[PDB]
Amino acid sequence: TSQVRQNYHQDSEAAINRQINLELYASYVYLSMSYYFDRDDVALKNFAKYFLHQSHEEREHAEKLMKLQNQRGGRIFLQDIKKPDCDDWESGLNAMECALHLEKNVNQSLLELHKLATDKNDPHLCDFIETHYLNEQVKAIKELGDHVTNLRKMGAPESGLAEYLFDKHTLG
Amino acid sequence: TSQVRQNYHQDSEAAINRQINLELYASYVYLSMSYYFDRDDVALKNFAKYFLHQSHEEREHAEKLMKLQNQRGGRIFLQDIKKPDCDDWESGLNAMECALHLEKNVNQSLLELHKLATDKNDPHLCDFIETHYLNEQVKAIKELGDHVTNLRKMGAPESGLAEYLFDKHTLG
Amino acid sequence: TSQVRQNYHQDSEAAINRQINLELYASYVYLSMSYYFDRDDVALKNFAKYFLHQSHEEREHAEKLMKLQNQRGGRIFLQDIKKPDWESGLNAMECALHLEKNVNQSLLELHKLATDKNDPHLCDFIETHYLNEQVKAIKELGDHVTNLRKMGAPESGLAEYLFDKHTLG
Amino acid sequence: TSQVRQNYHQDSEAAINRQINLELYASYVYLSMSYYFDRDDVALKNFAKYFLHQSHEEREHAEKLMKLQNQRGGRIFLQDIKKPDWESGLNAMECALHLEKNVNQSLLELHKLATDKNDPHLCDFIETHYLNEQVKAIKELGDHVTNLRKMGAPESGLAEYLFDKHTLG
Amino acid sequence: TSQVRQNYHQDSEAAINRQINLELYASYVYLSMSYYFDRDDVALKNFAKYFLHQSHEEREHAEKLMKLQNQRGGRIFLQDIKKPDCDDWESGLNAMECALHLEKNVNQSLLELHKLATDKNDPHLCDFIETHYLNEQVKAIKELGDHVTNLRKMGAPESGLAEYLFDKHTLG
Amino acid sequence: TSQVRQNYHQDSEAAINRQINLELYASYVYLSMSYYFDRDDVALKNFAKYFLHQSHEEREHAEKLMKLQNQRGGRIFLQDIKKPDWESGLNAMECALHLEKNVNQSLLELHKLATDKNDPHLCDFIETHYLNEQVKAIKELGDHVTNLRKMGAPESGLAEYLFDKHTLG
Ligand SMILES: [Fe+3]
Ligand SMILES: [Fe+3]
Ligand SMILES: [Fe+3]
Ligand SMILES: [Fe+3]
Ligand SMILES: [Fe+3]
Ligand SMILES: [Fe+3]
Ligand SMILES: [Fe+3]
């Protein structure tokens, strides 16, 4: 047992490790989306810039959890990072919806982790999640929701002019 | 025979000379396209800048090949620069498609030139093509693919508003 | 078929996609090593810095291949990123040396392939952006392994401490 | 017919199109001369700079005419750019003098035309941007030809070397 | 056997070592030429700087190959550096002519090294030579030819005024 | 016979020429030592930088001797540069100490010659530019040799690691 472990439940340790896989998985999904819009038959350079930035942020969510695992005296166990659920993403509106679905699933997992940490009376772990994860997710979901709303009002996906302008005037 | 010639086959010398004519030809074509959009009844000022920039680049592609010819001890032979295959280019999408066909023809001639240079064991000429031409054509061709793809999704060529906005927000 | 594809074989495409997976696997392997050295019972902070930097660089190798796939008109296909396969720093440097040689052999098979299909663009891309990077990387890891062994690693904990302060610092 | 065309005769349009071709032809001639002096068996680098500079300038004369064609509502029609028709530096400077006088004679034919068609804008365009350029250009080439003759060109290779160093540098 | 060696043929290693000797020999030749023109009865200071600059450039060619040898896991094996083939070099034109012949022999050795590297499927060694050696030799041969051509046009070597002015106005 | 020669004995001229070869030989030795320490199974980067510096410094000694030869009116005659005659860092420093002592012994024989032939200028050249450089060179190498032995070289690889970082860095 670690010389620094104190008030760190085994269940919290296992859940952090599963959350690390989830954050890495989300990074893969966003990385997949990005280069889909980098394709010459999609060619929305700013969508690809948007999803690539999100891919790097999820990777940082993961590295910071690995850092916490060590801080509390637990032990990282890594798993496979499953491939994303689409190779082809149809459109910019459709992609924004999948990102909203994914970011909501990450939030649901972070809220289960906080419920667990409260169950185990782990205030440091509770406030770690509240500080670094919970509100970041609240803004990502509100942000992704604004975009879906606008892309729909403009005539996406049937109007290719709509996604061009959105990609210029919102994602630029 | 030149005091500097070494490992430079006749066939490579002849091919460089044909490649010089092609590069000047592409310069003439983009120059033709450019001022077509400069006309008051077409009047897309940024399409004309995009193509004028490309016309100046092909002139640099040719002059650089003329420079290599002298470096390797061969002798420049100049031919007529044939007039472009269209005087009226229809629209912006159509110009972009002819630009893509032309850059692909230039690329195929360079690939034959590198196949030639490999078969004649001219490693210096091979690296010349790789450094100064092959990756430039890959980017010109992917770039033109992006523009064609977007112009079609925006509703070109039947929608003149599309080419107006594309000229403002992409070629600006 | 893609409007930009020209002189890009289907085998070259399939290999680029396979190489993308390997580069991402290499990033995962180094990331695993890094935070191993961040553990309080290892506590070699510069070892952890070194491996984390190499992890991010493999992510740069992978994204650049995804960029090339689109440039040539091919289509990205992603697979699972398999989890890595660490005792001490000398032992980690040795697995990294084994890993960069494996990534290197995969790149040489891809360049032999691109040479066979007469793809001079893909040949130069591999030569330019990947091949000399692996030669530097492997020579560097070889230096570290060599030095760590002469100082008395892994049996000497003073050795890996000092190597972490004066070489990786 | 163009919504901007006003007092621009069809003969003036046809002639501007011919003058465009000649300007591009002159650029080709100078481009040919330039890289001739870049050859290792000629090796007069400032002669080669000089002619390349003139090649880019004739290209600037041509593109300005393509601009005027559109300003008046006319329509550009392009033809082939004929290949140029060099022994030494004095010989090249003399062929350049013959060429600039032919471009000049063509421009004066264009101004007589514009005068006959009562096109004062086209007249001042030629007076402003081309006529004094040709007079300058021809006086310059004459100065060089005169000097290279007095120094002993072309049989004296010391002459063309020094001229390349001290006048064209 | 080296822990870093991978796809490096014993023949390529042996060829690098011989090329190391040739680059040091070329360095010796230029150094000999340089101080020949420093002599009080020749007294062309800029010819002597020019060859001295070339002597140092060849040493850099040697040290960089000594670096590659170690990078690929081979073993440097040094030989005698044989003295240059002339003590007196007659004039500046004759020295430039021996420099031209010397760079052509160094180039021919490099083309044989690349042919070797091609036939043993060492693309890294193939590109090293292309990047750092092949075009440097072409420019070096093109430069030496220009100087040779110009010196002969001025009346060298029988005209001492010719080599004086060349030393002032070209090599100054 | 040269128009500048005055009080320069043939033996001194011949002795300068032999000293030129010895300096180039010392340069070959240090360059050989340097890249030995660049090897991945030796991997002491600062030893390799130290010897590379000395290799370049010996080349400066030779060229200055080539400069004096022309200044006094003698004639440079070059010979083959014989290949160098390395185990560890201590052993390399010991051959370097041995080498500088032979270059020094040759310089003191050159100064004895110059004194016997009444060449005060050549006497000053050796005094100013060479003799004290060698004393500093030999005193330094002895210091390094002394320290390596105290730290446990060559049987202690940790000793040469630390010496390379803390003295030669
Ligand atoms: Fe996240
Ligand atoms: Fe081109
Ligand atoms: Fe990699
Ligand atoms: Fe290459
Ligand atoms: Fe003109
Ligand atoms: Fe060289
Ligand atoms: Fe010395």
PDB file of N, CA and C in Angstrom, chain A residues 39-44 160-161 164 168, chain B residues 30 33 37 47 50-51 91-104 139-159 162-163 166-167 170-171, chain C residues 1-4:
ATOM      1  N   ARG A  39     -11.164  16.227 -44.990  1.00  0.00           N
ATOM      2  CA  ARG A  39     -11.243  15.563 -46.278  1.00  0.00           C
ATOM      3  C   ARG A  39     -11.630  16.554 -47.369  1.00  0.00           C
ATOM      4  N   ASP A  40     -11.093  16.331 -48.570  1.00  0.00           N
ATOM      5  CA  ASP A  40     -11.347  17.248 -49.673  1.00  0.00           C
ATOM      6  C   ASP A  40     -12.801  17.250 -50.110  1.00  0.00           C
ATOM      7  N   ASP A  41     -13.559  16.199 -49.814  1.00  0.00           N
ATOM      8  CA  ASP A  41     -14.981  16.150 -50.121  1.00  0.00           C
ATOM      9  C   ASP A  41     -15.827  16.567 -48.926  1.00  0.00           C
ATOM     10  N   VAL A  42     -15.195  17.067 -47.876  1.00  0.00           N
ATOM     11  CA  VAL A  42     -15.946  17.688 -46.803  1.00  0.00           C
ATOM     12  C   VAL A  42     -15.445  19.129 -46.690  1.00  0.00           C
ATOM     13  N   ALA A  43     -14.160  19.291 -46.371  1.00  0.00           N
ATOM     14  CA  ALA A  43     -13.436  20.552 -46.557  1.00  0.00           C
ATOM     15  C   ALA A  43     -14.073  21.733 -45.819  1.00  0.00           C
ATOM     16  N   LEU A  44     -14.302  21.562 -44.514  1.00  0.00           N
ATOM     17  CA  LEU A  44     -14.684  22.646 -43.593  1.00  0.00           C
ATOM     18  C   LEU A  44     -13.511  22.774 -42.618  1.00  0.00           C
ATOM     19  N   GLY A 160     -26.083  23.292 -47.992  1.00  0.00           N
ATOM     20  CA  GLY A 160     -24.633  23.319 -47.880  1.00  0.00           C
ATOM     21  C   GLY A 160     -24.077  24.708 -47.651  1.00  0.00           C
ATOM     22  N   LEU A 161     -24.810  25.738 -48.097  1.00  0.00           N
ATOM     23  CA  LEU A 161     -24.462  27.127 -47.805  1.00  0.00           C
ATOM     24  C   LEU A 161     -24.502  27.424 -46.306  1.00  0.00           C
ATOM     25  N   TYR A 164     -21.242  26.137 -44.616  1.00  0.00           N
ATOM     26  CA  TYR A 164     -20.131  26.988 -45.027  1.00  0.00           C
ATOM     27  C   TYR A 164     -20.067  28.244 -44.172  1.00  0.00           C
ATOM     28  N   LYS A 168     -17.435  29.544 -41.193  1.00  0.00           N
ATOM     29  CA  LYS A 168     -16.673  30.787 -41.279  1.00  0.00           C
ATOM     30  C   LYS A 168     -16.957  31.720 -40.107  1.00  0.00           C
TER      31      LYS A 168
ATOM     32  N   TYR B  30      -3.434  30.244 -66.006  1.00  0.00           N
ATOM     33  CA  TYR B  30      -3.907  30.938 -64.806  1.00  0.00           C
ATOM     34  C   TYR B  30      -3.968  32.444 -65.039  1.00  0.00           C
ATOM     35  N   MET B  33      -7.235  32.882 -66.852  1.00  0.00           N
ATOM     36  CA  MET B  33      -8.371  32.778 -65.937  1.00  0.00           C
ATOM     37  C   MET B  33      -8.484  34.038 -65.096  1.00  0.00           C
ATOM     38  N   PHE B  37     -11.932  36.923 -64.630  1.00  0.00           N
ATOM     39  CA  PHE B  37     -12.695  37.354 -63.470  1.00  0.00           C
ATOM     40  C   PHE B  37     -12.505  38.841 -63.167  1.00  0.00           C
ATOM     41  N   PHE B  47     -11.207  36.005 -56.874  1.00  0.00           N
ATOM     42  CA  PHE B  47     -10.878  34.953 -57.831  1.00  0.00           C
ATOM     43  C   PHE B  47      -9.732  35.407 -58.732  1.00  0.00           C
ATOM     44  N   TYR B  50      -6.477  35.185 -56.716  1.00  0.00           N
ATOM     45  CA  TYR B  50      -6.054  33.800 -56.535  1.00  0.00           C
ATOM     46  C   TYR B  50      -5.344  33.260 -57.780  1.00  0.00           C
ATOM     47  N   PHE B  51      -5.933  33.460 -58.959  1.00  0.00           N
ATOM     48  CA  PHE B  51      -5.356  32.901 -60.176  1.00  0.00           C
ATOM     49  C   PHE B  51      -4.117  33.665 -60.632  1.00  0.00           C
ATOM     50  N   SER B  91     -17.638  30.177 -65.149  1.00  0.00           N
ATOM     51  CA  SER B  91     -17.950  30.487 -63.754  1.00  0.00           C
ATOM     52  C   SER B  91     -16.713  30.249 -62.901  1.00  0.00           C
ATOM     53  N   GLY B  92     -16.863  30.477 -61.599  1.00  0.00           N
ATOM     54  CA  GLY B  92     -15.789  30.270 -60.657  1.00  0.00           C
ATOM     55  C   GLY B  92     -15.568  28.811 -60.341  1.00  0.00           C
ATOM     56  N   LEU B  93     -16.659  28.067 -60.164  1.00  0.00           N
ATOM     57  CA  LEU B  93     -16.521  26.629 -59.966  1.00  0.00           C
ATOM     58  C   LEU B  93     -15.836  25.984 -61.157  1.00  0.00           C
ATOM     59  N   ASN B  94     -16.266  26.349 -62.372  1.00  0.00           N
ATOM     60  CA  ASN B  94     -15.706  25.736 -63.574  1.00  0.00           C
ATOM     61  C   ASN B  94     -14.233  26.094 -63.740  1.00  0.00           C
ATOM     62  N   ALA B  95     -13.858  27.313 -63.372  1.00  0.00           N
ATOM     63  CA  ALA B  95     -12.458  27.691 -63.438  1.00  0.00           C
ATOM     64  C   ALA B  95     -11.653  26.835 -62.487  1.00  0.00           C
ATOM     65  N   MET B  96     -12.160  26.684 -61.270  1.00  0.00           N
ATOM     66  CA  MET B  96     -11.485  25.854 -60.293  1.00  0.00           C
ATOM     67  C   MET B  96     -11.334  24.415 -60.773  1.00  0.00           C
ATOM     68  N   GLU B  97     -12.316  23.894 -61.514  1.00  0.00           N
ATOM     69  CA  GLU B  97     -12.219  22.517 -62.000  1.00  0.00           C
ATOM     70  C   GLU B  97     -11.167  22.399 -63.096  1.00  0.00           C
ATOM     71  N   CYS B  98     -11.086  23.397 -63.981  1.00  0.00           N
ATOM     72  CA  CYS B  98     -10.038  23.403 -64.994  1.00  0.00           C
ATOM     73  C   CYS B  98      -8.667  23.608 -64.358  1.00  0.00           C
ATOM     74  N   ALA B  99      -8.603  24.410 -63.284  1.00  0.00           N
ATOM     75  CA  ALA B  99      -7.349  24.562 -62.560  1.00  0.00           C
ATOM     76  C   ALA B  99      -6.893  23.230 -61.980  1.00  0.00           C
ATOM     77  N   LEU B 100      -7.838  22.461 -61.429  1.00  0.00           N
ATOM     78  CA  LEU B 100      -7.526  21.157 -60.858  1.00  0.00           C
ATOM     79  C   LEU B 100      -7.055  20.168 -61.925  1.00  0.00           C
ATOM     80  N   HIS B 101      -7.721  20.148 -63.081  1.00  0.00           N
ATOM     81  CA  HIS B 101      -7.283  19.291 -64.181  1.00  0.00           C
ATOM     82  C   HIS B 101      -5.873  19.656 -64.635  1.00  0.00           C
ATOM     83  N   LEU B 102      -5.565  20.960 -64.700  1.00  0.00           N
ATOM     84  CA  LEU B 102      -4.243  21.403 -65.144  1.00  0.00           C
ATOM     85  C   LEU B 102      -3.162  21.013 -64.144  1.00  0.00           C
ATOM     86  N   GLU B 103      -3.379  21.279 -62.842  1.00  0.00           N
ATOM     87  CA  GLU B 103      -2.374  20.911 -61.850  1.00  0.00           C
ATOM     88  C   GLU B 103      -2.183  19.412 -61.806  1.00  0.00           C
ATOM     89  N   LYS B 104      -3.236  18.636 -62.092  1.00  0.00           N
ATOM     90  CA  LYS B 104      -3.044  17.193 -62.161  1.00  0.00           C
ATOM     91  C   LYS B 104      -2.219  16.797 -63.368  1.00  0.00           C
ATOM     92  N   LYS B 139      -0.227  19.686 -52.492  1.00  0.00           N
ATOM     93  CA  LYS B 139      -0.960  20.731 -51.779  1.00  0.00           C
ATOM     94  C   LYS B 139      -1.830  21.573 -52.716  1.00  0.00           C
ATOM     95  N   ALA B 140      -1.333  21.897 -53.911  1.00  0.00           N
ATOM     96  CA  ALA B 140      -2.156  22.616 -54.886  1.00  0.00           C
ATOM     97  C   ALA B 140      -3.394  21.819 -55.263  1.00  0.00           C
ATOM     98  N   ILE B 141      -3.253  20.488 -55.371  1.00  0.00           N
ATOM     99  CA  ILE B 141      -4.349  19.616 -55.791  1.00  0.00           C
ATOM    100  C   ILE B 141      -5.359  19.387 -54.659  1.00  0.00           C
ATOM    101  N   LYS B 142      -4.895  19.185 -53.423  1.00  0.00           N
ATOM    102  CA  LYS B 142      -5.813  19.103 -52.285  1.00  0.00           C
ATOM    103  C   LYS B 142      -6.495  20.438 -52.028  1.00  0.00           C
ATOM    104  N   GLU B 143      -5.774  21.542 -52.215  1.00  0.00           N
ATOM    105  CA  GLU B 143      -6.399  22.840 -52.021  1.00  0.00           C
ATOM    106  C   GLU B 143      -7.505  23.058 -53.031  1.00  0.00           C
ATOM    107  N   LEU B 144      -7.213  22.804 -54.306  1.00  0.00           N
ATOM    108  CA  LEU B 144      -8.224  22.960 -55.340  1.00  0.00           C
ATOM    109  C   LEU B 144      -9.379  21.999 -55.122  1.00  0.00           C
ATOM    110  N   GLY B 145      -9.107  20.811 -54.586  1.00  0.00           N
ATOM    111  CA  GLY B 145     -10.197  19.910 -54.268  1.00  0.00           C
ATOM    112  C   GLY B 145     -11.115  20.483 -53.210  1.00  0.00           C
ATOM    113  N   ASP B 146     -10.546  21.140 -52.205  1.00  0.00           N
ATOM    114  CA  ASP B 146     -11.372  21.779 -51.186  1.00  0.00           C
ATOM    115  C   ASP B 146     -12.299  22.830 -51.798  1.00  0.00           C
ATOM    116  N   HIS B 147     -11.741  23.718 -52.620  1.00  0.00           N
ATOM    117  CA  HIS B 147     -12.532  24.788 -53.227  1.00  0.00           C
ATOM    118  C   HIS B 147     -13.649  24.237 -54.100  1.00  0.00           C
ATOM    119  N   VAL B 148     -13.346  23.261 -54.942  1.00  0.00           N
ATOM    120  CA  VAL B 148     -14.401  22.707 -55.769  1.00  0.00           C
ATOM    121  C   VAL B 148     -15.499  22.139 -54.885  1.00  0.00           C
ATOM    122  N   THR B 149     -15.108  21.360 -53.878  1.00  0.00           N
ATOM    123  CA  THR B 149     -16.101  20.708 -53.033  1.00  0.00           C
ATOM    124  C   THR B 149     -17.011  21.737 -52.386  1.00  0.00           C
ATOM    125  N   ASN B 150     -16.428  22.801 -51.842  1.00  0.00           N
ATOM    126  CA  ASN B 150     -17.223  23.808 -51.147  1.00  0.00           C
ATOM    127  C   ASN B 150     -18.114  24.578 -52.107  1.00  0.00           C
ATOM    128  N   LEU B 151     -17.583  24.973 -53.261  1.00  0.00           N
ATOM    129  CA  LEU B 151     -18.387  25.737 -54.203  1.00  0.00           C
ATOM    130  C   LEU B 151     -19.628  24.953 -54.619  1.00  0.00           C
ATOM    131  N   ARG B 152     -19.510  23.623 -54.740  1.00  0.00           N
ATOM    132  CA  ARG B 152     -20.669  22.812 -55.107  1.00  0.00           C
ATOM    133  C   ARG B 152     -21.683  22.737 -53.973  1.00  0.00           C
ATOM    134  N   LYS B 153     -21.216  22.590 -52.735  1.00  0.00           N
ATOM    135  CA  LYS B 153     -22.145  22.507 -51.619  1.00  0.00           C
ATOM    136  C   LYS B 153     -22.853  23.833 -51.405  1.00  0.00           C
ATOM    137  N   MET B 154     -22.206  24.947 -51.749  1.00  0.00           N
ATOM    138  CA  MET B 154     -22.865  26.234 -51.585  1.00  0.00           C
ATOM    139  C   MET B 154     -23.909  26.505 -52.666  1.00  0.00           C
ATOM    140  N   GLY B 155     -23.952  25.710 -53.728  1.00  0.00           N
ATOM    141  CA  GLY B 155     -24.929  25.885 -54.775  1.00  0.00           C
ATOM    142  C   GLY B 155     -24.416  26.479 -56.068  1.00  0.00           C
ATOM    143  N   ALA B 156     -23.098  26.435 -56.320  1.00  0.00           N
ATOM    144  CA  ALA B 156     -22.519  26.899 -57.573  1.00  0.00           C
ATOM    145  C   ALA B 156     -22.660  25.821 -58.648  1.00  0.00           C
ATOM    146  N   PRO B 157     -22.764  26.209 -59.932  1.00  0.00           N
ATOM    147  CA  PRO B 157     -22.675  27.560 -60.492  1.00  0.00           C
ATOM    148  C   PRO B 157     -24.023  28.250 -60.724  1.00  0.00           C
ATOM    149  N   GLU B 158     -25.126  27.546 -60.461  1.00  0.00           N
ATOM    150  CA  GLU B 158     -26.446  28.119 -60.693  1.00  0.00           C
ATOM    151  C   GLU B 158     -26.771  29.236 -59.705  1.00  0.00           C
ATOM    152  N   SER B 159     -26.143  29.246 -58.517  1.00  0.00           N
ATOM    153  CA  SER B 159     -26.346  30.304 -57.523  1.00  0.00           C
ATOM    154  C   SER B 159     -25.175  31.291 -57.553  1.00  0.00           C
ATOM    155  N   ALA B 162     -23.636  32.295 -54.205  1.00  0.00           N
ATOM    156  CA  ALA B 162     -22.644  31.373 -53.676  1.00  0.00           C
ATOM    157  C   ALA B 162     -21.243  31.829 -54.048  1.00  0.00           C
ATOM    158  N   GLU B 163     -21.011  32.115 -55.337  1.00  0.00           N
ATOM    159  CA  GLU B 163     -19.653  32.481 -55.737  1.00  0.00           C
ATOM    160  C   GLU B 163     -19.247  33.830 -55.163  1.00  0.00           C
ATOM    161  N   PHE B 166     -18.301  32.888 -51.506  1.00  0.00           N
ATOM    162  CA  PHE B 166     -17.047  32.135 -51.522  1.00  0.00           C
ATOM    163  C   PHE B 166     -15.867  33.048 -51.827  1.00  0.00           C
ATOM    164  N   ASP B 167     -16.027  33.962 -52.789  1.00  0.00           N
ATOM    165  CA  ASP B 167     -14.964  34.905 -53.131  1.00  0.00           C
ATOM    166  C   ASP B 167     -14.616  35.809 -51.947  1.00  0.00           C
ATOM    167  N   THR B 170     -13.573  32.894 -48.498  1.00  0.00           N
ATOM    168  CA  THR B 170     -12.474  31.943 -48.639  1.00  0.00           C
ATOM    169  C   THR B 170     -11.281  32.529 -49.377  1.00  0.00           C
ATOM    170  N   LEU B 171     -11.502  33.188 -50.510  1.00  0.00           N
ATOM    171  CA  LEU B 171     -10.418  33.716 -51.327  1.00  0.00           C
ATOM    172  C   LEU B 171     -10.013  35.129 -50.923  1.00  0.00           C
TER     173      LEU B 171
ATOM    174  N   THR C   1     -14.596   7.464 -55.808  1.00  0.00           N
ATOM    175  CA  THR C   1     -13.162   7.758 -55.824  1.00  0.00           C
ATOM    176  C   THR C   1     -12.877   9.265 -55.698  1.00  0.00           C
ATOM    177  N   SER C   2     -11.777   9.597 -55.013  1.00  0.00           N
ATOM    178  CA  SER C   2     -11.474  10.975 -54.640  1.00  0.00           C
ATOM    179  C   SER C   2     -10.979  11.788 -55.833  1.00  0.00           C
ATOM    180  N   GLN C   3     -11.420  13.045 -55.904  1.00  0.00           N
ATOM    181  CA  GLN C   3     -11.046  13.936 -56.996  1.00  0.00           C
ATOM    182  C   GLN C   3      -9.590  14.392 -56.942  1.00  0.00           C
ATOM    183  N   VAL C   4      -8.867  14.135 -55.851  1.00  0.00           N
ATOM    184  CA  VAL C   4      -7.450  14.498 -55.763  1.00  0.00           C
ATOM    185  C   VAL C   4      -6.526  13.299 -55.850  1.00  0.00           C
TER     186      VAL C   4
END
